[PDB]
Enzyme design. Structure first.
Site, mmCIF file in Angstrom:
data_model
loop_
_atom_site.group_PDB
_atom_site.id
_atom_site.type_symbol
_atom_site.label_atom_id
_atom_site.label_comp_id
_atom_site.label_asym_id
_atom_site.label_seq_id
_atom_site.Cartn_x
_atom_site.Cartn_y
_atom_site.Cartn_z
ATOM 1 N N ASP A 164 0.771 -1.337 -0.103
ATOM 2 C CA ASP A 164 -0.033 0.038 -0.001
ATOM 3 C C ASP A 164 1.017 1.204 -0.083
ATOM 4 O O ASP A 164 1.274 1.680 0.983
ATOM 5 C CB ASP A 164 -0.922 0.032 1.267
ATOM 6 C CG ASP A 164 -1.746 1.027 1.183
ATOM 7 O OD1 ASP A 164 -1.999 2.054 0.406
ATOM 8 O OD2 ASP A 164 -2.276 1.361 2.344
ATOM 9 N N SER A 204 -0.621 15.532 -12.085
ATOM 10 C CA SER A 204 -0.750 15.410 -13.356
ATOM 11 C C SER A 204 -1.029 16.349 -14.170
ATOM 12 O O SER A 204 -1.453 17.575 -13.903
ATOM 13 C CB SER A 204 -2.318 14.430 -13.410
ATOM 14 O OG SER A 204 -2.541 14.032 -14.878
#
EC number: 3.4.23.22
Length: 330
Positions: A35, A199
């Site tokens: 994770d 992004s």
């Protein structure tokens, strides 16, 4: 040193991925959910409340000659999906894919919430976010990656998740045979303890690319792609009959649909998520309403590039002094 371990989807939807991990002496092998959105290595154990164990393999520290109680240390964690676990702490030897760390904090669960109990395939979590998020008190502990780092050939790990197929986690090297083209690296903020990056935009299907900054985290422990409501609405508007259902808890679409791809930007590069990756199947067994793999982050407080996005790429988690993230097509 290096390590290399295969990671395998737990079910037919790629809800999560498990990777075998050796703990203790002699080795006890547990299948852990790696994770990158958390920083605790915790396991089902001989200390876990019996009624909360249903099929998991447990770690038994009393059977390990190298286990030592970390006296006074406790831990307690809550995840974004509302699940939780807590307990006490041992140190022991932990190996992943041939890479060994001695003195790793192994957090033994005394209690786990129902979602963990109900997932018989997940024996615990191995956190790979920054150690500043580790929940051990009163002495915060380091992640497996942080402990291994100085011994690694290169201070990196990579995630290469499969779509309905096994993939790989590598530590200490970049496998240049595992991706196509070049790797594009992008800046990371560690301010919130995550692999947080920005992004450069998105496209829906064959549509034009929209240049827009989307801050979010690379999180292997989250199944879906959670993005701003504007972006998600633009995606689902291209699927006939798709809608957001408060009763279901997100966007659903007709199971008869063919889903468009979704592209996200990494600098000037582009990662394309095929439409099939965005299909999470019937909302309930036999339903003709299917659950979408792109969902709104509104009310989460953060955008999450979860498995839906990451499995479309070869992803480098660069833990050098200035951390960065790299993405390549594959």
């Amino acid at each position: 040193s290096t390590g290399s371990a295969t990671t395998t989807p737990i079910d037919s939807l790629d809800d999560a991925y498990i990777t075998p991990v050796q703990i203790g002496t002699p080795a006890q092998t547990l299948n852990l959910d790696f994770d990158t959105g958390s920083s605790d290595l915790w396991v089902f154990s001989s200390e876990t409340t019996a009624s909360e164990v249903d099929g998991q393999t447990i770690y038994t520290p009393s059977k390990s000659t190298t286990a030592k109680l970390l006296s006074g240390a406790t831990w307690s964690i809550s995840y974004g999906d509302g699940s939780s676990s807590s307990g006490d702490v041992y140190t022991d030897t932990v190996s992943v894919g041939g890479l060994t760390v001695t003195g790793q904090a192994v957090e033994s669960a005394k209690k786990v919430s129902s979602s963990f109990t109900e997932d018989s395939t997940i024996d615990g979590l191995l956190g790979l976010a920054f150690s500043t998020l580790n929940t051990v008190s009163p002495t915060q502990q380091k992640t497996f990656f942080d402990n291994a780092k100085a011994s690694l050939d290169s201070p990196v790990f990579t995630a290469d998740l499969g779509y309905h197929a096994p993939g790989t986690y590598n530590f200490g090297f970049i496998d240049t045979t595992a991706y196509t083209g070049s790797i594009t690296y992008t800046a990371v903020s560690t301010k919130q303890g995550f692999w947080e990056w920005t992004s450069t935009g998105y496209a829906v299907g064959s549509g034009t690319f929209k240049s827009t900054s989307i801050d979010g985290i690379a999180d292997t422990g989250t199944t879906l792609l959670y993005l701003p409501a504007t972006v998600v609405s633009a995606y689902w508007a291209q699927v006939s009959g798709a809608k957001s259902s408060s009763s279901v808890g997100g966007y659903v679409f007709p199971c008869s649909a063919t889903l468009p791809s979704f592209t996200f930007g990494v600098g000037s590069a582009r990662i394309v998520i095929p439409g099939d990756y965005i299909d999470f199947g019937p909302i309930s067994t036999g339903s003709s309403s299917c659950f979408g793999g792109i969902q709104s982050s509104a009310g989460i407080g953060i955008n999450i590039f979860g498995d839906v996005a990451l499995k479309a790429a070869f992803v480098v988690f660069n833990g050098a002094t200035t951390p960065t993230l790299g993405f390549a097509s594959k």
